[PDB]
């Protein structure tokens, strides 16, 4: 029942793939945790996620949607200075910042079925630009929607723009959301922009 130790990292930065927490993820099971957002925003149900991650018995990190093939005709190389690593701009190891390709952000859809015989932890983000000019520059559309639906989760996001105080050199925010996918359940993502797509997910038992 050895504890999982994150060191200088919080549970938020470790689960999202903060470029400053690359040396971690050493165990498949633990009884408690000993312990962080590179792009500012709100983390919904965060302390509930810490409860469910407090003790696991079969932890595993897998590629939920590969960097290629998953999101064709969209740009997937998005990095920012807020998530700097070794002086080079980077981004979360488990999320993809989908942006337009060739001036177009077409309507997007992709799905995953849980066939790993355990609970799957899927995390994603929703980007809120600080002015409408950059909203259309990144995602082409003016009114954006992000649809995440499973057999036990369903929510649509209508991101709107506001000018917010400067934090970490940034004035826009990214809200982070998550859900647990039961065995045999399916999750579908639908968006025309403002989606920080899941890149790596986690499969686990107990919680």
């Amino acid at each position, epitope marked *: 029942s050895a504890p999982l130790q994150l060191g200088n990292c919080s549970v938020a930065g470790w689960i999202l793939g903060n470029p400053e927490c690359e040396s971690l993820i050493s165990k498949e099971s633990w009884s408690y945790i000993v312990e962080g957002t590179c792009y500012p925003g709100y983390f919904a149900d965060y302390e509930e996620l810490r409860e469910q991650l407090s003790s696991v018995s079969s932890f595993e990190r897998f590629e939920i949607f590969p960097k290629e093939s998953s999101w064709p005709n969209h740009t997937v*190389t*998005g990095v920012t200075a807020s998530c700097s690593h070794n002086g080079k701009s980077s981004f979360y190891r488990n999320l993809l910042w989908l942006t*337009e390709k060739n*001036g177009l952000y077409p309507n997007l859809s992709n799905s995953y079925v849980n066939n790993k015989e355990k609970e799957v932890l899927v995390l994603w983000g929703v*980007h809120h630009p*600080s*002015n409408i000019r*950059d909203q259309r*520059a*990144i995602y082409h559309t003016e009114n954006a929607y992000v649809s995440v639906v499973s057999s036990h989760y369903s929510r649509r996001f209508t991101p709107e723009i506001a000018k917010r105080p400067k934090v970490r050199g940034q004035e826009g925010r990214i809200n982070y959301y998550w859900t647990l996918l039961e065995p045999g359940d399916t999750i579908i993502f639908e968006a025309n922009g403002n989606l920080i797509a899941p890149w790596y997910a986690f499969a686990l038992s107990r919680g």
Partner: antibody
Amino acid sequence: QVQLQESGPGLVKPSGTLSLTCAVSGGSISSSNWWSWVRQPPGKGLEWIGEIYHGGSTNYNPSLKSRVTISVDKSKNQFSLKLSSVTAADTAVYYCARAPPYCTSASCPDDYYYYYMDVWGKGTTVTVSG
Amino acid sequence: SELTQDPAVSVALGQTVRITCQGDSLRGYYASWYQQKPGQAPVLVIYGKNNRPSGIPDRFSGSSSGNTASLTITGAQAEDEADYYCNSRDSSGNHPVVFGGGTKLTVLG
């Protein structure tokens, strides 16, 4: 993938209006791109004229704003340039180019803070003479 | 603001030349470079931070330091004799685009 065809008259009378048209192929004019215009007088350097976003918003050179009008026609996938009150100083070679989208705030990926013009038209020579 | 560059510079065949472009509009957005030969249209050679379009040899490299962007040509050749313009968008106001004065590059030898 995207190319630009240029059109217009090669001779404009003094005090008249210059009129050029750029045709977009392999892409929609209604995409997140800044369709620009550049001119180059004989023997001088490049001079930026202005740009237009497919929504209708425009941005012009402060020294030429009084006489420049850039439009967009989504019906024919074209964008044009109009310069009124032309003199010998407006005799130049004119180009239509494409510029990427950009951001004014920090809430964007790094690749949206570049400025370049990768796709160019072949160039139309315009002469101001009677 | 405005971009200023030296009107002419020369380099021997097989050596290295550094075309410098200075302006206050360089810290905001990333600068781009163009090569223009006589009677022809400009072709983009450098954009962003040392990113070359497909078709530009690795001899062309770009860098930036403060209010100064530079274009470096390693192992210059006779085919590199042309005019070189820096280009960037200003970070204030309506964000107008400004071209440098251009630098006529002569390849000696």
